[PDB]
Amino acid sequence: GTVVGIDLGTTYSCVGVFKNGRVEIIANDQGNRITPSYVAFTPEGERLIGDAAKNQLTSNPENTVFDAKRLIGRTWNDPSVQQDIKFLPFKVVEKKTKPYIQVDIGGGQTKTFAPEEISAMVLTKMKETAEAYLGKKVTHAVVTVPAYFNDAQRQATKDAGTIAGLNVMRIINEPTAAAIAYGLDKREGEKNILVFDLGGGTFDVSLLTIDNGVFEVVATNGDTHLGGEDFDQRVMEHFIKLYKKKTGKDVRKDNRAVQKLRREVEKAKRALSSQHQARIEIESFFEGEDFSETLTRAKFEELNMDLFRSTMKPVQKVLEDSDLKKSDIDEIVLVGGSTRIPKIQQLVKEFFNGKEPSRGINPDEAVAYGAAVQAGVLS
Amino acid sequence: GTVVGIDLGTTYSCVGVFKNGRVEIIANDQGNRITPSYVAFTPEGERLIGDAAKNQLTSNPENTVFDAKRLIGRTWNDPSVQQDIKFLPFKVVEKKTKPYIQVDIGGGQTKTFAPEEISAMVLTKMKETAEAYLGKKVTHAVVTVPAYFNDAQRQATKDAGTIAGLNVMRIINEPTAAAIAYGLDKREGEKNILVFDLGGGTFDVSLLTIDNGVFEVVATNGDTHLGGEDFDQRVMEHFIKLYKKKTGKDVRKDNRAVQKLRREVEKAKRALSSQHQARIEIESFFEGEDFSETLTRAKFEELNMDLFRSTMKPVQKVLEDSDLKKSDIDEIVLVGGSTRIPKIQQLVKEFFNGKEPSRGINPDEAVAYGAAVQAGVLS
Ligand SMILES: Nc1ncnc2c1ncn2[C@@H]1O[C@H](COP(=O)(O)OP(=O)(O)O)[C@@H](O)[C@H]1O
Ligand SMILES: Nc1ncnc2c1ncn2[C@@H]1O[C@H](COP(=O)(O)OP(=O)(O)O)[C@@H](O)[C@H]1O
Ligand SMILES: [Ca+2]
Ligand SMILES: [Ca+2]
Ligand SMILES: [Ca+2]
Ligand SMILES: [Ca+2]
């Protein structure tokens, strides 16, 4: 009789359960409370899901699948699909006017998967994560989707559940889930909520109205290809140029070196949300040469200042599309791992003339938290 | 007086003497025919040189000095110095546009040493090693330097001798010393010699012409930061990841654990030059947990395949810069401890279409051997 809440995110997924009047965000077998939305197929024929899949991307780039959420429930002709497939390192082929993911599954075998079949494997891992913690079977979930997801995208997400042996009882909007997490449904009267959702690869801004516990998505905007990955990319460019200046070595050719730098840049960025300097040190980086540079928050902000500023444009556009002033916003909800960046928090607060956002919930767990609350009601 | 030949190497040094019509490589107080180019200052005010210095590095990282050869006779502004100081665990400070090593010498006192003062202490140890075996004082030496060393680096090496109470009668090029050890100086006609020198931290390739006993260094190349250290690091990374997978323990945090693994990895690598498997076993490795893994030559080669292949590029480059073809190479000389690796010997031989290298001289001792022959002539 257990119903879990699942954030099926673009780069990470999160599972929670309402138990003893509180939401418990469930840590996976590695002790991580979020799991990469990654699936890998080894030459030996082993299926890897989550951390294991992400950690062997560099050695297995063609048969490591991610960003299936970009393709799920879309037609081949969708301009979004035509753009995305050019940048995914695994083969995407057209069958029956739909994108399919073609991978080597080992034993000289190729297999073509629908995007919802890949998402099904991610949901299987989140289901197994919940089962291990509770010590019983989990066959029911509330799953979250972007507010702008159409009927076909919502149905494909339910289908992912069915393939994974989950009854997806309700599909709920990500910004609504975030609002529920902060108990903004339990607010009395009519309130305008601005949800600012910045993840690994996507930026979503949503204007919600709440009226006596009923939510309405009034307007949505953002950038489908702006997230934390882009902030990493700006730092990567900087240090690749700086390394060539200092040592004379060009590392762009060496995938191993670039991969090692990307890992340490990601780590450095995360640290710079809670401290002002982060040391990037890599032993035997390139031709036996070592890498050592300190990234300051100032430098990180400088390298990304235009990208950070650009997040305000979709906020102004949802206010315009909603026929609202910045004074009409009653609640600001910042969710997604990238909203941890102090400069992002500063720019949003400055935009709303010093108005503090909602706080108390882990921003990369907030969507799953909301799903878990709704899952609790259905349980 | 008796003139000794000294290989003053980056990581190891070696002293030889010509006596009874043969070179004798002199074993130190511990019975080792090579001595670590290491100096350590204890809190008690004791100055340790060689084996003793290297053995207490883990407990005394800030006041254990090594790789002085990377700094000797260089200016502060030298791009080489600016890179290297970032990866040395002891303090390097600028005085009078030059690098100086600052260390705690005990009794609440700090002392700044020029690189040549640290090398002087290494030469003092090699001097005492020779004096003990000979039973008389040694005040004359021939010392080897890399072929690419400039006037300042050569003069600073002579200065290191003077500080140690040695008259450095001649500074000879390391690849020339290697060639002299194999008696290639006593060949009639104009021969082209490829010297492939792979040590603990450095890779040097030299094209020498020998014309009836007169040497010319025609071209030099290699990788200033590629050596045996890097091959260890590739194995270290593998086993740190494997241990985490099998036990759930992350050992990067514990310097004690990492130090123990590095020691056994170094021993395992050495064994894999003469056998196909090496057992790495550490009792109470991490929080009382033990470590047991077998390293095969195959796995060692796989982890380092790109680094090993990379050593062929500088060989092709010296041929190009010398306006010579592979077929023009008359002698191949492999020196340095890392040339013991079978895969390295295979790649060089395959590069030169099955041409066997010079053999008979211990590759660890070949440079010191050559220095000793030249020292024997000046005697
Ligand atoms: N402390 C932090 N500082 C900066 N960025 C962070 C921090 N923690 C996580 N992130 C970023 O959050 C992004 C992931 O967002 P998340 O909401 O977890 O995933 P998704 O992309 O699936 O929405 C990544 O780009 C990651 O680098
Ligand atoms: N049998 C062996 N197999 C592989 N590497 C070896 C072997 N013996 C020594 N080495 C390596 O040789 C390196 C030392 O090279 P050497 O020429 O003695 O010193 P230096 O670094 O001063 O040139 C170390 O990295 C050591 O691990
Ligand atoms: Ca992007
Ligand atoms: Ca190195
Ligand atoms: Ca997210
Ligand atoms: Ca050497």
Numbering used by the authors:
A (entry chain B), B (entry chain A): 28 to 406
Reported in the publication:
Like typical Hsp70s, BiP consists of an N-terminal nucleotide binding domain (NBD) and C-terminal substrate binding domain (SBD) connected by a hydrophobic linker peptide. In the ATP-bound state, the NBD and SBD are docked against each other and the SBD adopts an open conformation, allowing fast exchange of substrates. ATP hydrolysis to ADP causes domain undocking and closure of the SBD, leading to tight substrate binding. Nucleotide exchange resets the cycle and triggers substrate release.
To establish if the selective effect of Ca2+ on ADP binding to BiP is reflected in the structure of the complex, we purified the NBDs of mammalian BiP, Hsp70, and Hsc70 and co-crystallised them with Ca2+ and ADP. In each case, additional density in the nucleotide-binding cleft indicated occupancy by ADP and the overall conformations of the three NBDs were very similar. Overlay of the BiP(NBD) structure with the Hsp70(NBD) and Hsc70(NBD) structures revealed root-mean-squared deviations (RMSD) of 0.769 Å and 0.734 Å over the Cα alignment, respectively. Moreover, in each structure, Ca2+ was identified in the nucleotide- binding cleft, where it formed contacts to both phosphate groups (α and β) of the nucleotide as well as indirect contacts to protein residues via several water molecules (inset). The position of the Ca2+ ion and the coordinated water molecules were nearly identical in all three complexes and similar to a previously reported lower resolution structure of human BiP bound to CaADP. The BiP(NBD)•Ca2+•ADP complex also resembled the structures of BiP(NBD)apo and the NBD of BiPapo containing both its NBD and SBD. The Ca2+ ion in a structure of human Hsp70(NBD) in complex with Ca2+, ADP, and Pi occupies the same position as Mg2+ in a post-hydrolysis state NBD structure. Together, these findings reveal that Ca2+ participates in the coordination of ADP in the NBD, which is consistent with cooperative binding of Ca2+ and nucleotide to BiP. The NBD structures also revealed a second, surface-exposed Ca2+ ion that is coordinated by the carboxyl group of D257 and backbone carbonyl of H252 in BiP and homologous residues in the cytosolic Hsp70s. Ca2+ binding to this second site is likely an experimental artefact favoured by the high [Ca2+] in the crystallisation solution and crystal packing. However, the IC50 values for Ca2+-dependent inhibition of MABA-ADP release from the NBDs of Hsp70 (444.7 ± 80.5 µM) and Hsc70 (345.5 ± 71.1 µM) were much higher than from the NBD of BiP (57.1 ± 7.4 µM).
